RNA sequence: UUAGGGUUCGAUUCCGGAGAGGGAGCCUGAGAAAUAGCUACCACUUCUACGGAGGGCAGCAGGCGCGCAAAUUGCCCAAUGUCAAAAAAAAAAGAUGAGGCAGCGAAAAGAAAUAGAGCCGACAGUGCUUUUGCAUUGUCGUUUUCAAUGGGGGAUAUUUAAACCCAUCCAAAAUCGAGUAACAAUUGGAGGACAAGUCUGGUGCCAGCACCCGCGGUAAUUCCAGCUCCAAAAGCGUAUAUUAAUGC
């Protein structure tokens, strides 16, 4: 109206681990006018423009913390080289947010109770 | 007097845990025999089961009468008389209702006017006896 | 079980309450620089204590002891910042000239109304708590922050104001 | 006499008290009091200053 | 808790020791006199078509009992560790009431809302004054008026293992909302000690208050009610113990 909001991304502390072979980078973000907080797809389109990657899919991110007072917030990503490395490499909830994740294992309770009726058997 | 001397330490120690013994401010704190006598065992309160309505009469410069209580101990299996420290809330206290006791005050002698009694009862039935007297609460006979 | 976690008191009630003296001079802050409660006054106090005790604990100390000379220095580089004491000052005896109002004084809700952004210390305490105050470009909604002698020359407003 | 309790509070008028505008709170009530007592005056209690006084009528 | 010297507490997160209903004995193992291992006795206790066979929560929840007194038969192995033949993933993610998370939680502890401002009228103080009048400061008030914001609502969303709490926001083209601001603060006090009544009604040595000193016998500054004011304040009383007060 009297402006355009907009989603500013940037980077601050950045290392490559080739052991992993992954980036990890210390996310900033500004949003100046931005209404609410910034949904992650954005600062993974900025993020992809910056270190030339060609994906959304390679970048994974987690956590955002959004600091008191204004539009503010910073965070921590991922990016690794392939998707098989990430798909691989990867805690399972961090995937599951792209939905590359696996399926959730039944129930706690019920495997308990199985395993314990398994020791009586003897075939 | 004291003693001065740098090898005087043992002979002022056992003056110290000599004269002790005649403080009643040492007494009250290290001797068990002190504990067996309150009634409560020492704890902060009690519950008792009301007996009996008991009029009580008043000592000499102010006349007046005194609503207590004799109430029986659960814990100790003792009896204690209790005063009820409010206007008209005897009625509030009704035979072989649970109700709780506490101390007042000073708890090593007993409060004007009344003798022999040091506790009052604070809850009826776990209800705020205050909270009857300045209505908020009714009693349940539930 | 297992917290790590420390809890402090930071204000406490000083002995008999009922003091017609202590009473005046509690009313005469409150109501002036638009303090909540009485609670406020203590808390600075109790900080105020500590501080003047080391203060007099090292001044008792013979020159060129290191408890001295280390810990000296702090105590009159933090009362620099804040503007309690000036830079002409280095004695650890201008540190015990110290007293309750020149810490409220420092308080935000004062500093706002006295750099001339607020109209009475009520009117400040508001603009404050309304999200319409920084103290650099950092928004603060807390009436109780200790300015800098550097950052009460840089308050300005909030960019989510209205009235900036 | 084991029962004769309550007897005053029985006989007792109550005017069950009387409406009354809301108060100012936090440190507007603060406020409040160090205006009346404090300012306005010539004097500062003290006791020189009383906060509460009465009208007259009826002695002894 | 104490200026100092001291005084008092330690069941309880870390370290060390000991124990697993009460006792004793034993096997295996590098390590045990193990108890969600074994054997026996004793006190209890559960099944059985009664021929026999079992049980040990001072492990987590939960139940009964007990006492003045104390939480959910919740979710998760994502984190932190441990055990293992074991990295992850490859069709293909070991276990863990250790531990983490949430629920309940005014023990304790940190921050902070319940208003803020301009016009008019009344009151008080100070200065000047032709005593008419003016200026400054503060308070209170009307169907007085003006803005702003949280509690709360919602989300383009974000946090988290998943979901909340916090935070950020009411469009970026497009998303809520105060005026008696009913979104209305209480708990103890006002004779003395001790901050606050020359009050008004009721009671009349009765009812009751009172830690203590003392109030009440129709003239109550203390009782029982109302108004008024005071202290602390989202906390405030009461009980008991303990420390200061104590050079008792």
Redesign the pocket.
């Known amino acids: 109206?009297?402006?355009?909001?907009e989603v500013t991304v940037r980077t601050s502390q950045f290392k490559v681990n080739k052991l992993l072979n992954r980036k990890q980078f210390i996310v900033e973000v500004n949003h100046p006018?931005?209404?609410?907080?910034?949904?992650?797809?954005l600062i993974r389109s900025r993020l992809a423009s910056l270190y030339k990657v060609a994906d959304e899919n390679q970048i994974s991110?987690?956590?955002?913390?959004?600091?008191?007072?204004?539009?503010?917030t910073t965070?921590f990503g991922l990016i690794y080289d392939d998707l098989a490395a990430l798909?691989?490499?990867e805690?399972?909830?961090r995937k599951?947010?792209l939905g590359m994740?696996?399926?959730?294992?039944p129930?706690?309770?019920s495997?308990?109770e199985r395993?314990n009726r398994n020791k009586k058997i003897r075939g | 007097t004291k003693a001065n001397g740098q090898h005087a330490a043992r002979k002022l120690v056992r003056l110290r845990r000599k004269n002790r013994w005649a403080?009643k401010?040492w007494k009250?704190?290290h001797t068990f025999v002190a504990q067996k006598a309150?009634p409560?065992g020492?704890?902060?309160?009690?519950?008792?089961i009301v007996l009996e309505k008991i009029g009580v009469g008043?000592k000499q410069?102010?006349?007046?009468?005194?609503?207590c209580v004799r109430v029986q101990?659960?814990?100790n299996d003792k009896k204690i008389i209790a005063?009820?420290?409010?206007?008209?809330c005897?009625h509030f206290i009704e035979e072989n209702d649970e109700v709780?006791v506490?101390?007042?005050?000073?708890?090593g002698?007993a409060?004007?006017?009344?003798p022999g009694v040091?506790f009052?009862i604070?809850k009826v039935s776990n209800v705020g006896l205050?909270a009857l007297y300045?209505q908020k609460k009714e009693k349940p006979r539930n | 079980?297992?917290?790590?976690n420390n809890?402090?008191?930071?204000?406490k009630?000083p002995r008999?309450?009922?003091?017609?003296e202590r009473?005046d001079r509690?009313?005469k802050l409150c109501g002036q620089y638009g303090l909540?409660?009485?609670?406020?006054i203590?808390?600075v106090n109790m900080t105020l204590s500590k501080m003047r005790r080391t203060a007099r604990l090292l001044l008792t100390l013979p020159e060129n002891h290191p408890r001295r000379q280390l810990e000296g220095s702090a105590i009159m580089r933090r009362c620099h910042d804040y503007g309690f004491l000036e830079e002409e000052k280095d004695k650890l005896d201008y540190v015990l000239s110290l007293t309750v109002p020149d810490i409220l004084e420092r308080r935000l809700q004062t500093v706002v109304f006295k750099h001339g952004l607020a109209?009475?210390v009520?009117?400040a305490?508001?603009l404050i708590?309304?999200?319409?105050i920084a103290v650099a470009k950092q928004?603060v909604t807390?009436?109780?922050f200790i300015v800098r002698v550097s950052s009460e020359h840089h308050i300005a407003f909030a960019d989510?104001s209205?009235?900036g | 006499?084991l029962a004769?309790?309550?007897?005053?509070?029985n006989?007792?008028?109550?005017?069950?008290?009387?409406?009354?505008?809301?108060?100012?709170?936090?440190?507007?009530?603060?406020?409040?009091?160090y205006?009346?007592?404090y300012?306005?005056?010539?004097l500062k209690?003290?006791?020189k200053l009383?906060?509460?006084?009465?009208?007259?009528?009826?002695?002894?």
């Open positions: 109206q009297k402006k355009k909001a006018g931005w209404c609410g907080t910034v949904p992650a797809k991110v987690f956590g955002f913390k959004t600091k008191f007072g204004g539009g503010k965070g798909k691989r490499i805690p399972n909830y599951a947010r994740g696996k399926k959730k294992q129930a706690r309770k495997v308990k395993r | 403080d401010g009250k704190s309150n409560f020492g704890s902060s309160h009690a519950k008792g008043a410069p102010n006349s007046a009468i005194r609503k101990l659960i814990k005063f009820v420290p409010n206007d008209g005897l709780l506490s101390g007042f005050g000073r708890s002698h409060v004007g006017d009344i040091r009052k604070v205050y300045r | 079980m297992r917290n790590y809890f402090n008191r930071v204000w009630a008999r309450p009922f003091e017609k009473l509690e009313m909540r409660c009485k609670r406020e203590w808390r109209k009475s009520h009117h305490r508001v708590l309304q999200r319409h928004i807390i009436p109780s989510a209205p009235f | 006499s004769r309790a309550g007897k005053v509070k006989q007792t008028p109550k005017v069950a008290k009387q409406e009354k505008k809301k108060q100012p709170r936090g440190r507007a009530f603060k406020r409040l009091k205006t009346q007592r300012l306005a005056k010539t209690p003290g006791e009383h906060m509460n006084k009465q009208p007259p009528g009826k002695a002894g």
